[PDB]
C-alpha cells in the first residue's frame, strides 16, 4: 500500500527516494505504482513539444510547457535544448568543428568533470559504419573522441546481464544476473523481465557504479528510467540536474534507450525499418550535446556512448525442438531461445538423469544447431558456471537459431525477425564504445576490449576506488588522456629452487624404462651448460612466470625447454619453449616409443611413476614439451624425463598430439617463430580460479598424481612478424587456449575423422585470454619485457576470436 495523497509540487525527479507509504516523485515511482496523484501533471509536461520555434523566443514563461524559450530559461536551467540555436543565433554542437579538449573547461563550483553514460540497447557494432550517414552526432563523438571498432559483451548477450556487468565490472556468474530469466533454488524464487520479483535486492550482487560513487561521497543521478518517461524528458531531467547547486548536483548520470533493440527484434538488424530508430537515437544525442553546450558544459563533461549487445537475424522457422530428441520432454524445464538451460521439473523425481539427457542431445542430427554441455565443460572464456542459478545442463545455440521445448511453445506463447543472447565472440553480438571528453583522448582508435573493463575506467573518471571486480585495472589506461591509476606487478610469493644432480638412477623405482643406454669433453661440457641454463634466454623470452601463492617448486633447465616443476602437484606448473620458423619436426624414434626417464635432479618421492599409469586403465600420459620438436637426437632424451610427463586420457592425446606435432610448427611458420608456454590447470569447483591441493577430485589410480581439468598454452610472437619471435624489438602478439581435459571427444561431432578436420576448430572454440590462465594457475606472465606494464595488461586481456572481420 501507498498513501498516494501527497504532492510532487517542487519535487519533480527528486534525487532521494522516500519510504512507503509516502508518495514518490523520482523517475522510478511509475514502476512501483507509487507516484503522487499529480506526478504526470507537474513532472511529465508535454505541452508545445520539445523544441523552440522562432515565435517562442523571448516569450512569457508558461509553466505548462515541457521546456522553455523565455529569457529566464538559462538561469532556471530549463530551456528546450535548441533554444540558443533558434533564439540566440548559436550553431548546433554537430556543426562545430571539433577542437581538442586538453583540459576540462567547467563553470566555477565544478569539483570534477561530470560523467554521462549514454547507453543503447542492441546497438550492433557495425551500425557505426553502416548507419553512419544517418547518425551525424554519434559520428562526431566517435571520430573526435576515443573509440573502439567494437566492444565485447559478456555471455549471455542479453540485456540485464550486460547492463549489470557494465555497472559492476563482474561476470554474470559473480554478480548473479545470469540471464533475463532465472530460478534460485536457495531462495526458491524466480526472476523475469516482466514482474516485481526482479525488484528484490537479493538478486543483485556486487557493487554497481552508483553505489560505489555514493559510499565515496560522489553523488549519483538515478540510473533507471520508467518506460513511459520519454527520451526528451530524460535528457531535460539530466540537464536540469546539471544546473542544481554545487552541494546538490550529482557527478555521474545515466541515460538509457530501449532502441534500437526494440525495433531490431521486429525487423532484424538491418531491416529497412531500422534507419529510423538510428536517426532518432542520433537526434537525442544531438539534444544532449546542444543542451550541454547551452550550459557551457560541452568541453567539461565526459560522455560514454555504450551498447549492451548487438543483434542477429533470427526467425521462427529456425527453431530446434527438444521434443525431436527427447522421449521424456515433460520431465524437464527449459529456459529457451538463443541459449538453453535445462533442469528437472520436479525435485521429487529421482528418475531424472542429466547424463542420459545430454546423451540424447549429442550429435543426433547432421546440421544440428545447438550443442549440449555440462556447465563446467563450457569454454572457460565464457566464465559461465559458478552460480547456483546456472543450470547444470546448458545448450550453446548456433547464431541465427532458437531452441524451444515443443512446437506449441513457439506458436502458442512469425512474430520476430531479430534476436540476441548467443556466444559473446559472435560478430553480430559485438556492440559499441565511444568516450568523448577532457579525460579521454582526442581522435584515437583503441583495440577492441571487453565490457567487464569499463567499471574500472568509470571509477578512474570519477576519482573513485573500484570495488573488487573482473576487469584488469590499467588494461584500458590507453583510452585516457590522464590516468588516476598506475598498476604495479604483483609480488612473487614463492621463489623457486634450482636443484642440481642429487639422485642416482637406482634410487628410483617408478616402473619406467627407457632404451637410453647408448653412450668426449666436447659434447659433455656442452650439455652441462644446457642443464645450468645457457639456452634459457632462448626458451624463456619474457622472464619466468611468478608464482603468486605459497608452494614448493623447482626450475628445471634443458637444451630445448625450461620448466617450473611443482613438488606438490608432481608435474610442471608451466613449460616454456621457443620454436623458430626454421625449426624441424621429427618423429619419436621406434626404440623410444614407451621411454620415460627418471630426473636425477628431483627426488623419487616428488616424482610420478609409470606403474600407476599402467594400473589405471582410463588414464594414459603425455608430455608438455613435445618430443617431436627436439633440436637434436640427443636433446630428445630430455623430452622423456618423468618431470616433463602429465596425465592424459587417450581421447585427449588425440588433440594434444595434433597440436604438438602439426599446429605448433604451423604457427611458428606463419608467425616467424613462436614462444610456447604450456601447462596443466585444475578447476574442479569451476570457479575460474586455481584449485588448492585439497580441491582435487581425481588422481591417477593408486597414486597422488592429480588429474588436470584443463591444459593451456600461451603462444607469443612479435607483432611485427618481419622480426623473429626470439629477437623482437617491439609489441607482442599472443593467442592462448584452455582445452578441457575430457575422457571422450563427444564435444566434437566429427572426431571419428582425421585430427585435421576437427582438432583446430575445438582449439578455436576454447580460445582464452592470458588473464584467464593467470586466474586458473596463480601465475603472472610477461614479467620481463621491454614493454610498458599497461601495454602488457592490454596484451593479457586480448582474446583471439577467429571470427572474420566485422
Ligand atoms: C571476479 O571477481 C569477483 C569479485 O572480486 C571474484 O569473486 C570473489 O571471489 C572471492 C573468492 O572466491 C570471494 O571471497 C569469499 O567471500 C566470502 C564472503 O562473500 C560475501 O561477501 C562479499 C563481500 O560483501 C560479497 O561480495 C559476496 O556476494 C556473493 O554472494 C551473494 C550470495 O550469497 C551474492 O549476492 C553475490 O552475487 C556474490 O555471489 C557470488 O560469489 C559467491 C562466493 O562468495 C558464489 O558462491 C556465488 O556463486 C556468486 O558467484 C558474499 O555476500 C567468504 O565467505 C569466503 O571465505 C571462505 O573461504 C576462505 C578462503 O580464503 C576461508 O578463509 C574462509 O574460512 C571461508 O571459508 C568458509 O566457508 C566455506 C564455504 O562456505 C567453507 O567451506 C569453510 O569451511 C568455511 O566455513 C571468501 O573469502 C568473494 O566473495 C567473491 N566476490 C564476488 C562479488 O563474487 C571472482 O573470483 C572473480 N572471477 C574470476 C574468474 O577471477
Ligand atoms: O535505465 C535503465 O538502464 C540502467 C543502466 C544504464 C547504464 C548502465 C551502465 F552502463 F552505466 F553501467 C547500467 C544500467 F543498469 N533501465 C531501463 C529499464 C530496463 C532496464 C534498464 C528494464 N528494461 C527491459 O526490460 C528491456 C530489455 C530489452 C528491451 N528491448 N526493447 N525493450 C526492452 C525491454 C530496460
Ligand atoms: Ca539489451
Ligand atoms: Ca577452482
Ligand atoms: Cl536468459
Ligand atoms: K593407462
Ligand atoms: Na565425437
Ligand atoms: Zn533485445
mmCIF file of C-alpha atoms in Angstrom, residues 39-347:
data_model
loop_
_atom_site.group_PDB
_atom_site.id
_atom_site.type_symbol
_atom_site.label_atom_id
_atom_site.label_comp_id
_atom_site.label_asym_id
_atom_site.label_seq_id
_atom_site.Cartn_x
_atom_site.Cartn_y
_atom_site.Cartn_z
ATOM 1 C CA UNK A 39 3.193 13.395 -10.922
ATOM 2 C CA UNK A 40 2.049 13.324 -14.596
ATOM 3 C CA UNK A 41 0.701 16.881 -14.475
ATOM 4 C CA UNK A 42 3.708 18.545 -12.885
ATOM 5 C CA UNK A 43 6.579 16.217 -13.786
ATOM 6 C CA UNK A 44 5.585 14.991 -17.261
ATOM 7 C CA UNK A 45 4.594 18.173 -19.079
ATOM 8 C CA UNK A 46 4.397 17.734 -22.839
ATOM 9 C CA UNK A 47 2.673 20.945 -23.987
ATOM 10 C CA UNK A 48 4.259 22.603 -27.068
ATOM 11 C CA UNK A 49 6.721 19.768 -27.744
ATOM 12 C CA UNK A 50 10.476 19.706 -27.296
ATOM 13 C CA UNK A 51 11.886 22.482 -29.487
ATOM 14 C CA UNK A 52 11.923 26.296 -29.562
ATOM 15 C CA UNK A 53 10.265 27.802 -32.624
ATOM 16 C CA UNK A 54 11.116 31.363 -33.803
ATOM 17 C CA UNK A 55 7.842 32.730 -32.401
ATOM 18 C CA UNK A 56 8.533 31.223 -28.945
ATOM 19 C CA UNK A 57 11.630 33.384 -28.444
ATOM 20 C CA UNK A 58 11.601 35.915 -25.585
ATOM 21 C CA UNK A 59 8.151 34.521 -24.620
ATOM 22 C CA UNK A 60 6.452 34.837 -21.226
ATOM 23 C CA UNK A 61 7.212 31.840 -19.009
ATOM 24 C CA UNK A 62 4.233 29.484 -19.171
ATOM 25 C CA UNK A 63 4.920 26.739 -16.620
ATOM 26 C CA UNK A 64 2.666 24.262 -18.502
ATOM 27 C CA UNK A 65 5.256 23.919 -21.288
ATOM 28 C CA UNK A 66 7.555 20.908 -21.492
ATOM 29 C CA UNK A 67 10.521 23.237 -21.981
ATOM 30 C CA UNK A 68 11.008 26.981 -22.245
ATOM 31 C CA UNK A 69 12.062 29.610 -24.722
ATOM 32 C CA UNK A 70 11.651 32.521 -22.308
ATOM 33 C CA UNK A 71 14.547 34.799 -21.295
ATOM 34 C CA UNK A 72 14.892 33.326 -17.793
ATOM 35 C CA UNK A 73 15.192 29.708 -19.006
ATOM 36 C CA UNK A 74 19.034 29.584 -18.884
ATOM 37 C CA UNK A 75 19.024 30.676 -15.175
ATOM 38 C CA UNK A 76 16.189 28.243 -14.371
ATOM 39 C CA UNK A 77 18.153 25.573 -16.327
ATOM 40 C CA UNK A 78 15.079 24.509 -18.285
ATOM 41 C CA UNK A 79 15.266 25.734 -21.896
ATOM 42 C CA UNK A 80 14.465 23.432 -24.783
ATOM 43 C CA UNK A 81 17.782 22.083 -25.941
ATOM 44 C CA UNK A 82 17.697 24.082 -29.209
ATOM 45 C CA UNK A 83 16.889 27.447 -27.543
ATOM 46 C CA UNK A 84 20.175 29.272 -28.206
ATOM 47 C CA UNK A 85 20.295 27.930 -31.744
ATOM 48 C CA UNK A 86 16.863 29.295 -32.701
ATOM 49 C CA UNK A 87 16.569 32.347 -30.433
ATOM 50 C CA UNK A 88 20.224 33.419 -29.859
ATOM 51 C CA UNK A 89 21.911 32.713 -33.237
ATOM 52 C CA UNK A 90 24.141 29.845 -31.979
ATOM 53 C CA UNK A 91 25.058 26.732 -34.014
ATOM 54 C CA UNK A 92 24.234 23.084 -33.099
ATOM 55 C CA UNK A 93 27.079 21.138 -31.462
ATOM 56 C CA UNK A 94 27.263 18.797 -34.521
ATOM 57 C CA UNK A 95 28.036 21.708 -36.861
ATOM 58 C CA UNK A 96 31.037 22.952 -34.876
ATOM 59 C CA UNK A 97 34.470 21.680 -35.886
ATOM 60 C CA UNK A 98 35.963 19.550 -33.202
ATOM 61 C CA UNK A 99 38.699 21.065 -31.177
ATOM 62 C CA UNK A 100 40.878 19.029 -28.890
ATOM 63 C CA UNK A 101 39.821 19.257 -25.235
ATOM 64 C CA UNK A 102 43.214 19.420 -23.477
ATOM 65 C CA UNK A 103 41.793 20.314 -20.041
ATOM 66 C CA UNK A 104 38.323 20.377 -18.509
ATOM 67 C CA UNK A 105 36.606 23.712 -19.262
ATOM 68 C CA UNK A 106 33.990 23.788 -16.490
ATOM 69 C CA UNK A 107 31.938 26.504 -14.673
ATOM 70 C CA UNK A 108 33.149 27.519 -11.211
ATOM 71 C CA UNK A 109 31.975 25.198 -8.476
ATOM 72 C CA UNK A 110 32.522 22.024 -10.515
ATOM 73 C CA UNK A 111 34.911 19.874 -8.439
ATOM 74 C CA UNK A 112 35.275 17.185 -11.140
ATOM 75 C CA UNK A 113 34.245 16.684 -14.777
ATOM 76 C CA UNK A 114 30.772 15.047 -14.721
ATOM 77 C CA UNK A 115 30.394 11.613 -16.332
ATOM 78 C CA UNK A 116 27.370 10.864 -18.532
ATOM 79 C CA UNK A 117 26.703 7.313 -19.666
ATOM 80 C CA UNK A 118 24.534 7.180 -22.800
ATOM 81 C CA UNK A 119 23.582 3.521 -23.134
ATOM 82 C CA UNK A 120 21.827 1.994 -26.126
ATOM 83 C CA UNK A 121 20.125 -1.390 -26.173
ATOM 84 C CA UNK A 122 21.032 -3.673 -29.078
ATOM 85 C CA UNK A 123 23.397 -1.223 -30.773
ATOM 86 C CA UNK A 124 25.338 -3.606 -33.000
ATOM 87 C CA UNK A 125 28.967 -2.677 -33.585
ATOM 88 C CA UNK A 126 28.648 -2.446 -37.407
ATOM 89 C CA UNK A 127 25.929 0.246 -37.075
ATOM 90 C CA UNK A 128 28.782 2.710 -36.575
ATOM 91 C CA UNK A 129 29.901 2.228 -40.153
ATOM 92 C CA UNK A 130 26.655 1.048 -41.780
ATOM 93 C CA UNK A 131 24.350 3.722 -40.289
ATOM 94 C CA UNK A 132 26.970 6.460 -40.341
ATOM 95 C CA UNK A 133 25.074 8.679 -42.866
ATOM 96 C CA UNK A 134 22.137 8.981 -40.593
ATOM 97 C CA UNK A 135 23.975 9.494 -37.294
ATOM 98 C CA UNK A 136 25.960 12.780 -37.579
ATOM 99 C CA UNK A 137 26.083 13.475 -33.818
ATOM 100 C CA UNK A 138 27.206 9.944 -32.921
ATOM 101 C CA UNK A 139 29.797 10.057 -35.758
ATOM 102 C CA UNK A 140 31.237 13.309 -34.405
ATOM 103 C CA UNK A 141 31.565 11.767 -30.929
ATOM 104 C CA UNK A 142 33.210 8.711 -32.432
ATOM 105 C CA UNK A 143 35.770 10.419 -34.659
ATOM 106 C CA UNK A 144 36.624 13.336 -32.373
ATOM 107 C CA UNK A 145 36.774 11.195 -29.194
ATOM 108 C CA UNK A 146 38.205 7.818 -28.304
ATOM 109 C CA UNK A 147 36.542 4.772 -29.922
ATOM 110 C CA UNK A 148 36.987 1.017 -30.308
ATOM 111 C CA UNK A 149 35.911 -0.768 -33.562
ATOM 112 C CA UNK A 150 33.783 -2.805 -31.175
ATOM 113 C CA UNK A 151 33.331 -3.801 -27.576
ATOM 114 C CA UNK A 152 32.751 -7.419 -26.476
ATOM 115 C CA UNK A 153 29.682 -8.057 -24.284
ATOM 116 C CA UNK A 154 29.517 -10.814 -21.673
ATOM 117 C CA UNK A 155 27.681 -14.141 -22.153
ATOM 118 C CA UNK A 156 24.688 -14.445 -22.378
ATOM 119 C CA UNK A 157 24.464 -11.498 -24.655
ATOM 120 C CA UNK A 158 21.204 -10.391 -23.025
ATOM 121 C CA UNK A 159 20.240 -7.006 -21.558
ATOM 122 C CA UNK A 160 20.217 -7.425 -17.793
ATOM 123 C CA UNK A 161 23.422 -9.478 -17.579
ATOM 124 C CA UNK A 162 25.175 -6.943 -19.791
ATOM 125 C CA UNK A 163 23.838 -3.722 -18.205
ATOM 126 C CA UNK A 164 24.656 -5.065 -14.771
ATOM 127 C CA UNK A 165 28.143 -6.180 -15.914
ATOM 128 C CA UNK A 166 28.736 -2.669 -17.255
ATOM 129 C CA UNK A 167 27.721 -1.322 -13.846
ATOM 130 C CA UNK A 168 29.854 -3.719 -11.765
ATOM 131 C CA UNK A 169 32.854 -4.974 -13.769
ATOM 132 C CA UNK A 170 31.782 -8.525 -12.830
ATOM 133 C CA UNK A 171 30.915 -11.665 -14.797
ATOM 134 C CA UNK A 172 27.211 -12.575 -14.571
ATOM 135 C CA UNK A 173 28.276 -15.669 -12.569
ATOM 136 C CA UNK A 174 29.658 -13.306 -9.890
ATOM 137 C CA UNK A 175 27.042 -10.538 -9.980
ATOM 138 C CA UNK A 176 24.151 -13.055 -10.056
ATOM 139 C CA UNK A 177 22.136 -11.848 -13.015
ATOM 140 C CA UNK A 178 22.967 -14.897 -15.125
ATOM 141 C CA UNK A 179 20.130 -14.285 -17.608
ATOM 142 C CA UNK A 180 16.970 -12.325 -18.465
ATOM 143 C CA UNK A 181 15.101 -15.177 -16.717
ATOM 144 C CA UNK A 182 16.345 -17.197 -13.652
ATOM 145 C CA UNK A 183 15.414 -19.669 -10.872
ATOM 146 C CA UNK A 184 17.222 -19.605 -7.492
ATOM 147 C CA UNK A 185 16.884 -22.883 -5.513
ATOM 148 C CA UNK A 186 18.186 -21.473 -2.175
ATOM 149 C CA UNK A 187 15.602 -18.654 -2.310
ATOM 150 C CA UNK A 188 13.187 -20.956 -4.074
ATOM 151 C CA UNK A 189 12.202 -17.967 -6.224
ATOM 152 C CA UNK A 190 12.027 -16.891 -9.878
ATOM 153 C CA UNK A 191 13.159 -13.759 -11.794
ATOM 154 C CA UNK A 192 11.583 -12.484 -15.013
ATOM 155 C CA UNK A 193 11.750 -9.397 -17.271
ATOM 156 C CA UNK A 194 8.136 -8.513 -16.503
ATOM 157 C CA UNK A 195 7.131 -8.574 -12.844
ATOM 158 C CA UNK A 196 8.136 -7.426 -9.408
ATOM 159 C CA UNK A 197 10.471 -10.191 -8.133
ATOM 160 C CA UNK A 198 13.279 -8.557 -10.157
ATOM 161 C CA UNK A 199 12.880 -5.513 -7.841
ATOM 162 C CA UNK A 200 14.007 -7.571 -4.814
ATOM 163 C CA UNK A 201 17.587 -6.598 -3.861
ATOM 164 C CA UNK A 202 18.651 -10.203 -3.259
ATOM 165 C CA UNK A 203 19.113 -10.952 -6.960
ATOM 166 C CA UNK A 204 21.686 -8.190 -7.432
ATOM 167 C CA UNK A 205 25.238 -8.928 -6.250
ATOM 168 C CA UNK A 206 28.431 -6.929 -6.495
ATOM 169 C CA UNK A 207 28.587 -3.193 -6.219
ATOM 170 C CA UNK A 208 27.369 -1.112 -9.179
ATOM 171 C CA UNK A 209 28.840 2.238 -10.116
ATOM 172 C CA UNK A 210 26.103 4.353 -8.403
ATOM 173 C CA UNK A 211 26.679 2.633 -5.023
ATOM 174 C CA UNK A 212 30.486 2.872 -5.372
ATOM 175 C CA UNK A 213 30.018 6.573 -6.065
ATOM 176 C CA UNK A 214 27.583 7.232 -3.189
ATOM 177 C CA UNK A 215 29.718 5.498 -0.474
ATOM 178 C CA UNK A 216 32.723 7.530 -1.566
ATOM 179 C CA UNK A 217 30.913 10.875 -1.442
ATOM 180 C CA UNK A 218 30.321 11.298 -5.196
ATOM 181 C CA UNK A 219 26.621 11.989 -5.849
ATOM 182 C CA UNK A 220 24.786 9.957 -8.479
ATOM 183 C CA UNK A 221 21.846 10.706 -10.791
ATOM 184 C CA UNK A 222 19.377 7.840 -10.768
ATOM 185 C CA UNK A 223 20.352 5.412 -13.481
ATOM 186 C CA UNK A 224 16.998 3.684 -14.088
ATOM 187 C CA UNK A 225 14.139 5.267 -16.110
ATOM 188 C CA UNK A 226 10.473 4.217 -16.196
ATOM 189 C CA UNK A 227 9.459 3.064 -19.715
ATOM 190 C CA UNK A 228 6.725 5.726 -20.081
ATOM 191 C CA UNK A 229 9.135 8.672 -19.497
ATOM 192 C CA UNK A 230 10.096 9.751 -22.991
ATOM 193 C CA UNK A 231 13.683 10.218 -24.126
ATOM 194 C CA UNK A 232 13.351 14.002 -24.403
ATOM 195 C CA UNK A 233 12.200 14.239 -20.795
ATOM 196 C CA UNK A 234 15.159 12.055 -19.726
ATOM 197 C CA UNK A 235 17.573 14.450 -21.402
ATOM 198 C CA UNK A 236 15.902 17.532 -19.821
ATOM 199 C CA UNK A 237 15.883 15.910 -16.385
ATOM 200 C CA UNK A 238 19.657 15.232 -16.723
ATOM 201 C CA UNK A 239 20.246 18.797 -17.875
ATOM 202 C CA UNK A 240 18.128 20.207 -15.043
ATOM 203 C CA UNK A 241 20.142 18.116 -12.553
ATOM 204 C CA UNK A 242 23.306 19.653 -14.019
ATOM 205 C CA UNK A 243 22.010 23.154 -13.112
ATOM 206 C CA UNK A 244 21.498 22.273 -9.457
ATOM 207 C CA UNK A 245 23.611 23.975 -6.691
ATOM 208 C CA UNK A 246 27.138 22.534 -6.158
ATOM 209 C CA UNK A 247 26.259 20.700 -2.919
ATOM 210 C CA UNK A 248 23.199 19.050 -4.564
ATOM 211 C CA UNK A 249 24.441 18.328 -8.090
ATOM 212 C CA UNK A 250 25.355 14.724 -8.977
ATOM 213 C CA UNK A 251 28.604 13.920 -10.795
ATOM 214 C CA UNK A 252 27.501 10.739 -12.615
ATOM 215 C CA UNK A 253 24.417 10.318 -14.826
ATOM 216 C CA UNK A 254 22.859 7.579 -16.971
ATOM 217 C CA UNK A 255 20.609 7.766 -19.989
ATOM 218 C CA UNK A 256 19.091 4.570 -21.397
ATOM 219 C CA UNK A 257 17.452 3.875 -24.787
ATOM 220 C CA UNK A 258 15.390 0.735 -25.461
ATOM 221 C CA UNK A 259 16.208 1.433 -29.143
ATOM 222 C CA UNK A 260 17.428 0.022 -31.387
ATOM 223 C CA UNK A 261 16.930 -3.350 -29.646
ATOM 224 C CA UNK A 262 13.136 -2.967 -29.667
ATOM 225 C CA UNK A 263 12.825 -2.458 -33.434
ATOM 226 C CA UNK A 264 15.657 -4.942 -34.135
ATOM 227 C CA UNK A 265 13.640 -7.782 -32.680
ATOM 228 C CA UNK A 266 10.757 -6.939 -35.025
ATOM 229 C CA UNK A 267 12.674 -6.120 -38.205
ATOM 230 C CA UNK A 268 16.086 -7.772 -37.981
ATOM 231 C CA UNK A 269 19.444 -5.962 -37.541
ATOM 232 C CA UNK A 270 19.446 -4.349 -40.982
ATOM 233 C CA UNK A 271 15.728 -4.235 -41.738
ATOM 234 C CA UNK A 272 14.778 -1.164 -43.773
ATOM 235 C CA UNK A 273 12.643 -0.120 -40.764
ATOM 236 C CA UNK A 274 15.940 0.254 -38.797
ATOM 237 C CA UNK A 275 17.104 3.548 -40.335
ATOM 238 C CA UNK A 276 14.521 5.494 -38.328
ATOM 239 C CA UNK A 277 15.389 4.301 -34.742
ATOM 240 C CA UNK A 278 19.030 5.167 -35.592
ATOM 241 C CA UNK A 279 18.097 8.713 -36.759
ATOM 242 C CA UNK A 280 16.100 9.100 -33.566
ATOM 243 C CA UNK A 281 18.878 7.973 -31.172
ATOM 244 C CA UNK A 282 21.170 10.368 -33.004
ATOM 245 C CA UNK A 283 18.672 13.181 -32.605
ATOM 246 C CA UNK A 284 18.682 12.505 -28.829
ATOM 247 C CA UNK A 285 22.500 12.650 -28.674
ATOM 248 C CA UNK A 286 22.125 15.973 -30.516
ATOM 249 C CA UNK A 287 19.729 17.276 -27.841
ATOM 250 C CA UNK A 288 22.136 16.280 -25.047
ATOM 251 C CA UNK A 289 25.199 17.878 -26.713
ATOM 252 C CA UNK A 290 23.185 21.004 -27.607
ATOM 253 C CA UNK A 291 21.968 21.097 -24.007
ATOM 254 C CA UNK A 292 25.477 20.689 -22.618
ATOM 255 C CA UNK A 293 26.753 23.444 -24.910
ATOM 256 C CA UNK A 294 23.961 25.798 -23.702
ATOM 257 C CA UNK A 295 25.145 25.155 -20.178
ATOM 258 C CA UNK A 296 28.789 25.698 -21.260
ATOM 259 C CA UNK A 297 29.397 22.050 -20.245
ATOM 260 C CA UNK A 298 30.321 20.595 -23.650
ATOM 261 C CA UNK A 299 34.074 20.825 -23.027
ATOM 262 C CA UNK A 300 33.652 19.787 -19.377
ATOM 263 C CA UNK A 301 31.618 16.543 -19.284
ATOM 264 C CA UNK A 302 32.927 13.073 -20.168
ATOM 265 C CA UNK A 303 30.355 11.212 -22.265
ATOM 266 C CA UNK A 304 30.314 7.480 -22.761
ATOM 267 C CA UNK A 305 28.247 6.070 -25.622
ATOM 268 C CA UNK A 306 27.974 2.369 -24.962
ATOM 269 C CA UNK A 307 25.826 -0.611 -26.111
ATOM 270 C CA UNK A 308 24.948 -3.754 -24.097
ATOM 271 C CA UNK A 309 24.971 -6.309 -27.028
ATOM 272 C CA UNK A 310 24.359 -6.473 -30.776
ATOM 273 C CA UNK A 311 21.529 -8.109 -32.791
ATOM 274 C CA UNK A 312 21.331 -11.105 -35.165
ATOM 275 C CA UNK A 313 18.875 -12.325 -37.910
ATOM 276 C CA UNK A 314 16.698 -14.936 -36.216
ATOM 277 C CA UNK A 315 13.241 -16.242 -37.304
ATOM 278 C CA UNK A 316 10.597 -18.772 -36.023
ATOM 279 C CA UNK A 317 11.377 -21.417 -38.642
ATOM 280 C CA UNK A 318 14.976 -21.600 -37.352
ATOM 281 C CA UNK A 319 13.909 -23.339 -34.171
ATOM 282 C CA UNK A 320 15.209 -26.676 -32.929
ATOM 283 C CA UNK A 321 12.762 -28.585 -30.757
ATOM 284 C CA UNK A 322 13.907 -30.682 -27.831
ATOM 285 C CA UNK A 323 10.791 -32.792 -28.500
ATOM 286 C CA UNK A 324 12.569 -34.139 -31.615
ATOM 287 C CA UNK A 325 15.370 -35.528 -29.402
ATOM 288 C CA UNK A 326 13.887 -36.392 -26.053
ATOM 289 C CA UNK A 327 11.285 -39.006 -25.139
ATOM 290 C CA UNK A 328 10.777 -37.564 -21.606
ATOM 291 C CA UNK A 329 10.187 -33.934 -22.812
ATOM 292 C CA UNK A 330 7.738 -33.157 -19.945
ATOM 293 C CA UNK A 331 10.009 -34.124 -17.056
ATOM 294 C CA UNK A 332 12.179 -31.073 -17.914
ATOM 295 C CA UNK A 333 12.024 -27.274 -17.650
ATOM 296 C CA UNK A 334 13.716 -25.319 -20.427
ATOM 297 C CA UNK A 335 14.853 -21.712 -20.361
ATOM 298 C CA UNK A 336 14.568 -21.232 -24.123
ATOM 299 C CA UNK A 337 15.672 -19.048 -27.026
ATOM 300 C CA UNK A 338 19.182 -18.016 -28.100
ATOM 301 C CA UNK A 339 20.578 -20.175 -25.269
ATOM 302 C CA UNK A 340 19.181 -23.171 -23.445
ATOM 303 C CA UNK A 341 19.240 -24.145 -19.829
ATOM 304 C CA UNK A 342 17.637 -27.371 -18.605
ATOM 305 C CA UNK A 343 16.614 -28.587 -15.174
ATOM 306 C CA UNK A 344 14.225 -31.211 -13.750
ATOM 307 C CA UNK A 345 10.588 -30.133 -13.494
ATOM 308 C CA UNK A 346 10.282 -31.925 -10.122
ATOM 309 C CA UNK A 347 12.878 -32.187 -7.276
#
